[PDB]
Write a protein that binds this DNA or RNA. Structure first.
Lengths: 60, 43, 185, 96
RNA sequence: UUCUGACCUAUCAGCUUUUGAUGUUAGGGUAUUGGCCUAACAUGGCUAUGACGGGUAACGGGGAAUUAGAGUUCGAUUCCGGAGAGGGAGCCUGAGAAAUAGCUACCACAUCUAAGGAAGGCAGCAGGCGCGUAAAUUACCCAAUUCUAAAGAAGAGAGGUAGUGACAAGAAAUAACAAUGCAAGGUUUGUAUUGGAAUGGUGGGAAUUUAAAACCUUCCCAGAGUAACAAUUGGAGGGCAAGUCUGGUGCCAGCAGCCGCGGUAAUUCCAGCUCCAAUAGCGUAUAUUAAAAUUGUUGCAGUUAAAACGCUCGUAGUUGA
């Protein structure tokens, strides 16, 4: 809005079709839109599990 | 040594309650009051 | 790493604290222009002093000197924009001639008090803080905004203020009166 | 930071008469004993005999100050509470 | 690798050359030049225009603070460059390493072990202990900024975003106003009675913002009168702006940067009252710059205050019709 209201500044995008929206925008922006839901929620404990792995220590 | 008479005067004196008073002004308001009391009416 | 955004002191503390003539003069200035602190005077004083220093340096340089004509004209044009120098004057010795009441006269609170709206300098200062003023197209709550000449023609009320005709009165009292009237009737 | 060893009573230079209450403290850093001044009349009994003082300079670098001969340092916080705060009015915590 | 540029110290004056110091020749070695290293031969090289030592609470510079102009102090710390990864040393791979989240050993520390052996290096980010005058979360996120890859799509405590944060820096409330009554002025200006307006702060909801949330901004509800929604800090002889006001103490307690104050009227203590300076900031300490033309080139002083060598010759130095 900016001080004292009655006015709002932003930034806009208009794509050729929905396919373009699928192509050239990233997931949070899609979530913000409402196209697709938020994915996997492991966070940086994912990193901890990754570092828990050591190659050919387990069969996988 | 002659140490332990220390704290004499503060212990001796009476103790007085500090009263109420109507809120001393802050800021602009205090400055305006000062301006009037020093400079305006006097004469 | 450390942020690259800059920052600076606005003001310089005055030296020689208790000098009577200066001290009484500062109080006198506060009395006229409604400033909260000696600090407000000091920032304005510092601002004037920088201008005076720049002008002094410029006037040492010779006439027709390329840097001098360019920078001097530019600084003077900036003074015209601020409303510090009139039309007839256009020379660096009137820049040196600039003086602290003349600068205070260009505060937005002062301008409002002069133009009307409020009935007191102090009234103007609270009116500005409580968001009633507008420079046209833009709203402001800062009483140390300085007025430029092309903006002196558009001081107004804020359109979202009571005096602008927004939410029109005291909600509490008007509702209480209306409820009592409905109950009573 | 140091610890109080002994409570001492320095007598003034000639033109004044008083017994000035001072505090001998051993700095933690270097094992150095020094005599330090304590402002405030109740403050001599605001330090215990094996307490922790926060000592500072005394307005003058190493120079002797006023009446006191030989005192270069000043106590400004005791039992990690401020001396002045305890003294002034009792605005902050007594000894525990 | 050329040139040129530095802090303090003469109670450090001769240093360097067998163990390469300086050169010549020839080699070896290097990615390449070279005492870089071997052999043979010269006997040089550097030094009061301060070598060789010692000190440094010394990484260098871009720069920082203070400056009228000279200056003086500061520069671990955003960028650039160097150096190092507990202390030393030696190595592999590869274009690039004498690499430290590569390796081998020693010393100094030190974890697991069934005692046979094994594993170790936070000055990455968190967090702990200790040291201390002295310093934040075992946070969330790879969205942006960028990097690395078999390069969109994966990773990144690089990095961003919050949390903690009175380190600094900017903006800015703590009322405003009209009536009367009183006050002073030639219908005025000031100030205690009243009494309707104005509004953040604040609580709630949103709108929005956002990696996600929170903040910001914006809107709608709520929502000040002792506007208790309560401004503090340090002062009031002089220096130095404000008390020969009121009580207590009575040379004691104490204050006091300094001069001094305190022995029965304390303009200085201890209070209270009043007043004053700055103000969401204000005190104190230590260091440092100005003030200091008290380090003096600009710009000091040397008859007597500090200071002309006992006297002359004279080499370097500086200066020269």
């Amino acid at each position: 809005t900016l001080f004292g209201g009655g006015r709002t500044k932003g930034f806009g995008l208009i794509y050729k079709n929905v396919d373009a929206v699928k192509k050239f925008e990233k997931k949070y922006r899609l979530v913000r839109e409402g196209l697709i839901d938020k994915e996997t929620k492991a966070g940086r404990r994912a990193s901890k599990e990754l570092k828990n792995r050591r190659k050919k220590v387990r069969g996988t | 040594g002659s140490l332990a008479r220390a704290g004499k005067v503060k212990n001796q004196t009476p103790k007085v309650p500090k009263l109420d008073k109507k809120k001393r002004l802050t800021g602009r308001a205090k400055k305006r009051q000062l301006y009037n009391r020093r400079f305006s009416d006097n004469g | 790493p450390k942020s690259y955004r800059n920052y600076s002191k606005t003001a310089r503390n005055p030296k020689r604290p208790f000098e009577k003539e200066r001290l009484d003069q500062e109080l006198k200035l506060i009395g006229e222009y409604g400033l909260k602190n000696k600090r407000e005077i000091w920032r304005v004083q510092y601002l004037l002093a920088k201008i005076r220093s720049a002008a002094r340096y410029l006037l040492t340089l010779d006439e027709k000197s390329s840097k001098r004509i360019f920078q001097g004209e530019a600084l003077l044009r900036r003074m015209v924009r601020q409303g510090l120098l009139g039309e007839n004057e256009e020379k660096l010795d009137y820049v040196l001639g600039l003086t602290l009441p003349k600068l205070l006269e260009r505060r937005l609170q002062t301008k409002v008090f002069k133009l009307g709206l409020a009935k007191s300098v102090h009234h103007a200062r609270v009116l500005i803080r409580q968001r009633h003023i507008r420079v046209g197209k833009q709203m402001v709550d800062i009483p140390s905004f300085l007025v430029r000449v092309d903006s002196e023609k558009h001081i107004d009320f804020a359109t979202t203020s009571p005096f602008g005709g927004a939410r029109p009165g005291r909600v509490k009292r008007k509702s209480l009166k209306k409820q009592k009237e409905k109950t009573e009737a | 930071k140091g610890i109080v060893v002994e409570k001492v009573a320095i007598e003034a230079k000639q033109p004044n008469s008083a017994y000035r209450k001072c505090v001998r403290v051993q700095l933690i850093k270097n094992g150095k004993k020094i005599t330090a001044f304590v402002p405030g009349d109740g403050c001599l009994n605001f330090i215990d005999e094996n307490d922790e003082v926060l000592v500072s300079g005394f307005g003058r670098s190493g120079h002797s100050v006023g009446d006191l001969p030989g005192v270069k340092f000043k106590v400004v916080k005791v039992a990690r509470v401020s001396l002045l705060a305890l003294f002034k009015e009792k605005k902050e915590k007594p000894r525990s």
